[PDB]
């Protein structure tokens, strides 16, 4: 049957494994990467954000980006042939069609890729913990580039694809959602920060706890690609940390599972926090604090301080950051400290 | 009343207890502020 | 100060309940013969 022949061909072991999954992955993954690289150098964000956003206009690798669609578009999928662009390509470009393009395509591309892991895992006969792990990055992309703006007024408030264009996404969240004060974002960082620790710490523990299996100094060659004995003293490592930190692993199976857990759990939490910022259900204030600050003018914490930083961020940014609002804030209304 | 043959015993080692408690306590140190809000 | 009335009990049960869980297990594990 052709099917099994179609299969046969696909699951054939090439340089770049295709597989059934590839039928979804490669089309998308390439289009996403392509659209970005295209907009980054050719399409502008003038009709959309009143911003130059491509090399062709003068932007450098940091300032370039594929900016979101107008706020007028709302949550429109903005299809090349939809009511907006109307089959026209150039217009599509100027209305930020390239955003939902990269967004939606890349989205499927992350599905395809995880499927791939799942498919290749199965073939090679190994456990799918590489796929479970990758759920974490999906969640982030899904909640941040889709769920979030889906809760807001439109795609316009989703993070625009670009380096700097992402920094404002950060600054925004501080200023408007006071995101750094969110229990979930904290867990997020505890995981990414804590995950980048296990990474570094485990790596060094291994390289400096190795057995001598060669006569050279550059001990890299001294490794048996073909299993057998443990290449580093798991027993010595245990005693080291057990004497310098007080606690130390002693079950490589757990030490490695832990390494999957920490950063995947972290990112999952950071996602939930954002799924909540969609509805604006933020972790903005501490009521007991505000009440005391109202009645008593001499009460000051590093918290109150921050909130004022937010007021400034919102007041001085809102104007050129939300053009569709035709904001006009007279100089006299702009919050400012003394002298500055 | 035939002794159901689908049951196994349950276990939690000492280290797990510790790892468990460390998690419960710190989460509590992290969320109490927002509970008292 | 001007805090939440349920905050105390929310924090108390949030710590007790699951801790009590683990503990029940650990001790019943710990006492299994051989």
């Amino acid at each position: 049957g052709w099917f099994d022949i179609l299969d046969d061909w696909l699951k054939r072991d090439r340089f770049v494994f295709v597989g059934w999954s590839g039928i979804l992955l490669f089309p998308c993954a390439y289009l996403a990467l392509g659209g970005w690289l295209t907009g980054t150098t050719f399409v502008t964000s003038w009709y959309t954000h009143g911003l130059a956003s491509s090399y062709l206009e003068g932007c450098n690798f940091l300032t370039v980006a594929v900016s979101t669609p107008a706020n007028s578009m709302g949550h429109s999928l903005l299809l090349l042939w939809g009511p907006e662009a109307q089959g026209d390509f150039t217009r599509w470009c100027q209305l930020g069609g390239l955003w939902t393009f990269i967004a939606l395509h890349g989205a499927f591309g992350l599905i395809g890729f995880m499927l791939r892991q799942f498919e290749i895992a199965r073939l090679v006969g190994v456990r799918p913990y590489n796929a479970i792990a990758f759920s974490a990055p999906i969640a982030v992309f899904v909640s941040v580039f889709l769920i979030y703006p889906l809760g807001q007024s439109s795609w316009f408030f989703a993070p625009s694809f670009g380096v700097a264009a992402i920094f404002r996404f950060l600054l925004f969240f501080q200023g408007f959602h006071n995101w750094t004060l969110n229990p979930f974002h904290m867990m997020g960082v505890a995981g990414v920060l804590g995950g980048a620790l296990l990474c570094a710490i485990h790596g060094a523990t291994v390289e400096n706890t190795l057995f001598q299996d060669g006569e050279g100094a550059s001990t890299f060659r001294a490794f048996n690609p073909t299993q057998a004995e443990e290449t580093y003293s798991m027993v010595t490592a245990n005693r080291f940390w057990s004497q310098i930190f007080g606690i130390a692993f002693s079950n490589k199976r757990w030490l490695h599972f832990f390494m999957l857990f920490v950063p995947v759990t972290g990112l999952w939490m950071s996602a939930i926090g954002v799924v909540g910022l969609a509805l604006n259900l933020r972790s903005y204030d501490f009521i007991s604090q505000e009440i005391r600050a109202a009645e008593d003018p001499e009460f000051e914490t590093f918290y109150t301080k921050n909130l004022l930083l937010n007021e400034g961020i919102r007041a001085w940014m809102a104007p050129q950051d939300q053009p569709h609002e035709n904001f006009v804030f007279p100089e006299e209304v702009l919050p400012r400290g003394n002298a500055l | 009343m035939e002794p159901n043959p689908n049951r196994q015993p349950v276990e939690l080692n000492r280290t797990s207890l510790y790892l468990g408690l460390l998690l419960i306590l710190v989460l509590a140190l992290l969320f109490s502020s927002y509970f008292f809000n | 100060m001007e805090v939440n009335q349920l905050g105390l009990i929310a924090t108390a049960l949030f710590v007790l309940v699951p801790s009590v869980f683990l503990i029940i297990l650990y001790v019943q594990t710990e006492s299994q013969q051989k």
Binding site: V235, N238, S242, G246, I247, A248, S250 | N13, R14, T15, Y18, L21, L22, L25, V26, A28, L29, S32, S33, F36 | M1, V3, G7, L8, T11, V15
Partner: peptide, 30 residues
């Protein structure tokens, strides 16, 4: 009331620390 709750949990984590370092299951070989 809040202060007490914050310090208590902290005091509990330090207690844990102690027991974890000095009352772990001795790590046995082979």
């Amino acid at each position: 009331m809040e202060t007490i709750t914050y310090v208590f949990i902290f005091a509990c984590i330090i207690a844990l620390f102690f027991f974890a370092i000095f009352f772990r299951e001795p790590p046995r070989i082979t």
